[PDB]
Design a binder for this molecule. Structure first.
Ligand SMILES: Nc1nc2c(ncn2[C@@H]2O[C@H](COP(=O)(O)OP(=O)(O)O)[C@@H](O)[C@H]2O)c(=O)[nH]1
Ligand SMILES: [Mg+2]
Length: 167
């Protein structure tokens, strides 16, 4: 079976772990905070093709890890996650995308931009159009808003990332 090495990136507290665990294990972490950078495995079918996914759930961009450039070089596709309730987490993604492009030395890198915590619409500070606009600037043709808590678009993040990889 074809294996896909996916990497989930973004600033602290946006729901990287929550999205990864909801996808792979089908449960919501609540307050559980892995802070090991573990890999999680799940087999799926995307567009009638069997896929074995390995998903690396990274620590926040703010935090120490001696493995970041390695993660970026070796990752086949990247989910760049922000929270719709924190503008800083959205703006932080611009530098992380640039770091990936620098390491890969190319602009053509499978990526999905993800605005998480859509269930906190009442606390939204990042517009959906702003997210759509950032993906546009990246010439990236995949953008989603999600909720790890409400299970909205969780599977679709990873399915769409697989699609960007095997386009
Ligand atoms: N309301 C809501 N809370 C979320 C969501 N995703 C994560 N959380 C919560 O936000 C906090 C941080 O989540 P976590 O997965 O640890 O973020 P990480 O630092 O990016 O790995 C936790 O309290 C989570 O329960 C979501 O989609 N909706
Ligand atoms: Mg985490």
């Amino acid at each position: 079976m074809r294996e896909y090495k996916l990497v989930v990136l973004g600033s602290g507290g946006v729901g990287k772990s929550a999205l990864t665990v909801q996808f792979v294990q089908g449960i919501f972490v609540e307050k559980y905070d892995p802070t090991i950078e573990d890999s999680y495995r799940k087999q799926v079918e995307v567009d009638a093709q069997q896929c074995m996914l390995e998903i690396l759930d990274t620590a926040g961009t703010e935090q120490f890890t001696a493995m970041r450039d390695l993660y970026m070089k070796n990752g086949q596709g990247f989910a760049l996650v922000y929270s719709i309730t924190a503008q800083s987490t959205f703006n932080d993604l611009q530098d992380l995308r640039e770091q990936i492009l620098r390491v890969k030395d190319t602009d053509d890198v499978p990526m999905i931009l993800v605005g998480n915590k859509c269930d906190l619409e009442d606390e939204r500070v990042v517009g959906k159009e702003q997210g759509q606009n950032l993906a546009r600037q990246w010439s990236n043709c995949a953008f989603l808003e999600s909720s790890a808590k409400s299970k909205i678009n969780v599977n679709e993040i990873f399915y769409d990332l697989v699609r960007q990889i095997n386009r």
